Swiss-Prot record, chain A:
Keywords: Sporulation. This is Cell division inhibitor MciZ. Blocks Z-ring formation in the mother cell during sporulation by inhibiting the polymerization of FtsZ. Binds to the minus end of FtsZ and functions as a filament-capping protein. At high concentrations, is capable of both capping and sequestration of FtsZ. Decreases the GTPase activity of FtsZ. Induction: Expression is regulated by the mother cell-specific factor sigma E. InterPro entries: MciZ. The lineage of its organism: Bacteria, Bacillati, Bacillota, Bacilli, Bacillales. It holds the Pfam family MciZ. GO terms for biological process: sporulation resulting in formation of a cellular spore.
UniProtKB/Swiss-Prot annotation, chain B:
It is found in: Cytoplasm. Belongs to the FtsZ family. Keywords: Cell cycle, Cell division, Cytoplasm, GTP-binding, Nucleotide-binding, Septation. Essential cell division protein that forms a contractile ring structure (Z ring) at the future cell division site. The regulation of the ring assembly controls the timing and the location of cell division. One of the functions of the FtsZ ring is to recruit other cell division proteins to the septum to produce a new cell wall between the dividing cells. Binds GTP and shows GTPase activity. Homodimer. Polymerizes to form a dynamic ring structure in a strictly GTP-dependent manner. Interacts directly with several other division proteins. Interacts with FtsA. Interacts with Phi29 DNA replication protein 1. Interacts with the cell division inhibitor MciZ. The chain holds residues 13 to 314 of 382 of the full protein. The lineage of its organism: Bacteria, Bacillati, Bacillota, Bacilli, Bacillales. GO terms for biological process: cell division; division septum assembly; FtsZ-dependent cytokinesis; protein polymerization. This is Cell division protein FtsZ. GTP binds at G9, G10, G11, N12, N13, G96, T97, G98, E127, R131, D175. It comes from Bacillus subtilis (strain 168). Its main location: cytoplasm. Coiled coil: none annotated.
Amino acid sequence: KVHRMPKGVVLVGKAWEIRAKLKEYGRTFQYVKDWI
Amino acid sequence: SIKVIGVGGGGNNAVNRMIENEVQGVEYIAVNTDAQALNLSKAEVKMQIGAKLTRGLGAGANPEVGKKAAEESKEQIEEALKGADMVFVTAGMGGGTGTGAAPVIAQIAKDLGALTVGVVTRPFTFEGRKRQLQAAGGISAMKEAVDTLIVIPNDRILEIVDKNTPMLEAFREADNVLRQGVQGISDLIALDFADVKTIMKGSALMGIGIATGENRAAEAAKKAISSPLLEAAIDGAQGVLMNITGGTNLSLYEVQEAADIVASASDQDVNMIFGSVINENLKDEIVVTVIATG
């Protein structure tokens, strides 16, 4: 579960699940600004 | 619908600080037995409790009064809390109203079915025996009345601030830390609460790191996971909420790098709620709020 909200993003799930999702998002978004 | 309730003086300040920090998405309620102090709350909702009991004069650091105050205003409170999906009950323990009314209030919120997170400070040691005993008795009672109780040891504020910051600033920082405690979470709900709920019991301890510069996200996260507010080892946590906040310059390289630092330090199979939030009012500052529950 990954929640985009204005001014932020909240990932829910096991720690590793997130670390990995962040890396995925690390490949597709440079800044969290652009992310949302 | 998430309500942050500042109960008594400790909470009054936090809620002020929150408001001062333009923490969005929450309805604030400042609750106090002390009409004078209460009129200082920047809350839109100022609920004087124990008006009949204390006549606006407060609870005199008697938790029993704060309690009887809150019990007296048991109906006014539920009215104010109804509809709340989540209620932060923020208060200073050791006092009368904070110590006494917050459990009443939090318990009401908990009965209302709202995810009740108490976020309270345990008095500085220096506040003396009465403050320490009453809070202890009070924190004990908050635990029974909330889903999750983040308890911020003020004594640990003194480790963090410069050894020479005057007492007034030490108290002030406790207020901010209380605000930091609630914003750390409320900023992540502005999402199934049963996620957060599954993370909300037992007591909780939180940590914060703030850092600026080239290596900040890691600096921040290292300072967060190691922070004096965070008294036990995170590997001991069954659940961990992590909040990363930074300027528009917050990069996922920074975000995950902090997340990796918090994550490595937590158990591998840990449940985690993690968010990064952009605070336009930040420049090169970054703030990691880590809240561990277990």
